[PDB]
Design a protein around this ligand. Structure first.
Ligand SMILES: CCNC(=O)c1cccnc1N1CCN(C)CC1
Length: 377
């Protein structure tokens, strides 16, 4: 199994104990590390933060401590949107310009591959033709990587993608069988499956449906999404399950109603570290629990929740990560990806469950405890 962990280049701006840099990553923890995010200018890949070059060096320098560790650069993300992707795939010339730039960039800064985080082909402004053009782009990148590997006599660069969990987004976004052929790994975003935008409490990443989930709401769980990808053409072995080291919080309309599907008035408060509206890092959630919140367990969906006064949070813990990992193994998927390494309790001081408690749970469960962690020769 792979254990693939996203690192975010804005975690550096968090105050005090929240500050997270590439050198805070245990190089033995994950099998793959993904750097979020790269940008695009004139159909060519670029940095986005002022100090990305320095951070790349520290990030890829972690491979000097683990001979087996591989790194990838993720281009795009939510705020990036679809416009530069649409423009880049719109002509063969623009795609070639991009692919050439990527090969040069990854080799220069010593990344082992590219993760496409186009959110999403065929939606959020992206026209219908981008569904097929995304397939074309990925195939062309894969084949360019194959050719480059032989010309310079080095291992081939990897091409992966973070992909939609919403069924509508999947249907308008991906030619699954064709796309799966050329991608090395498919990182399925099996989280953000519920949120305050719905007007009621719901879990961030429930494994199974809740009894009341009817119609299209029955699709908002890890099991359905992963199986949808598999049943519609993606090989299980290439499919990577998304694991969140964060939760979504809510403001309860009635503090007396604290169950799944309880009416809410909006997003819960930003945390003191990640400072994200409606989102708490796992370590921020641990503070919530320590400060007197009541623990809940969503039994049908195998995930925890917690509430105090008018604040409700749906999240993942050691128990839920374990259950999901056992499920993953039973279904013979390629492994797990984690958003994000900087949201786990990396210091171990918030949750008192050791360093990186959530990711460590996956490392143990996926048979990676005895994985090689030695500097290269
Ligand atoms: C911060 C923006 N993140 C992304 O675009 C992203 C890219 C790849 C995988 N997961 C992503 N998240 C979507 C937003 N969620 C709140 C966390 C996970």
């Amino acid at each position: 199994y792979q254990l693939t962990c996203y690192f975010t280049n804005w975690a550096q701006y968090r105050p005090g104990l929240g500050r997270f840099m590439p050198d805070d990553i245990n190089p033995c923890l994950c099998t793959h590390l993904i750097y979020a995010f790269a940008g695009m200018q004139n159909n060519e890949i670029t940095t986005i933060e002022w100090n990305d070059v320095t951070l790349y060096q520290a990030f890829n320098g972690l491979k000097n401590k683990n001979s087996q560790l591989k790194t990838l650069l993720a281009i795009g993300g939510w705020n990036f949107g679809t416009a530069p992707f649409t423009a880049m795939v719109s002509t063969p010339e623009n795609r070639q310009t991009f692919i050439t730039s990527v090969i040069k960039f990854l080799r220069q800064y010593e990344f082992d591959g590219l993760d496409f985080d186009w959110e999403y082909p065929g939606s959020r402004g992206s026209p219908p033709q981008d569904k097929h053009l995304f397939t074309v782009l990925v195939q062309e990148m894969r084949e360019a990587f194959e050719q480059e590997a032989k010309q310079i006599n080095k291992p081939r660069l990897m091409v992966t993608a973070a992909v939609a969990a919403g069924i509508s987004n999947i249907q308008s976004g991906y030619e699954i069988p064709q796309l799966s052929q050329y991608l090395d790994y498919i990182h399925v975003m099996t989280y953000d499956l519920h949120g305050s935008w719905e007007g009621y409490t719901g879990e961030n990443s429930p494994l199974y449906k809740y009894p009341t989930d009817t119609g299209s709401n029955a699709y908002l769980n890890v099991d359905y999404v992963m199986n949808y990808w598999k049943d519609n053409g993606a090989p299980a072995e290439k499919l990577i399950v998304g694991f969140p080291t964060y939760g979504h919080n809510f403001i309860l309309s009635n503090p007396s109603n604290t169950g799944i599907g309880a009416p809410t008035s909006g997003a819960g408060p930003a945390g003191p570290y990640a400072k994200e509206s409606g989102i708490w890092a796992y370590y921020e959630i641990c503070t919530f629990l320590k400060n007197g919140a009541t623990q809940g367990w969503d039994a049908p969906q195998e995930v925890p929740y917690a509430y105090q006064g008018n604040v409700w949070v749906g999240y993942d813990n050691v128990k839920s990560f374990d259950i999901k990992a056992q499920w993953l193994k039973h279904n013979k998927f390629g492994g797990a990806m984690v958003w994000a390494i900087d949201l786990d309790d990396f210091t171990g001081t918030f949750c008192n469950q050791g360093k990186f408690p959530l990711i460590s749970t996956l490392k143990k469960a996926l048979g990676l405890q005895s994985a090689s962690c030695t500097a290269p020769a």
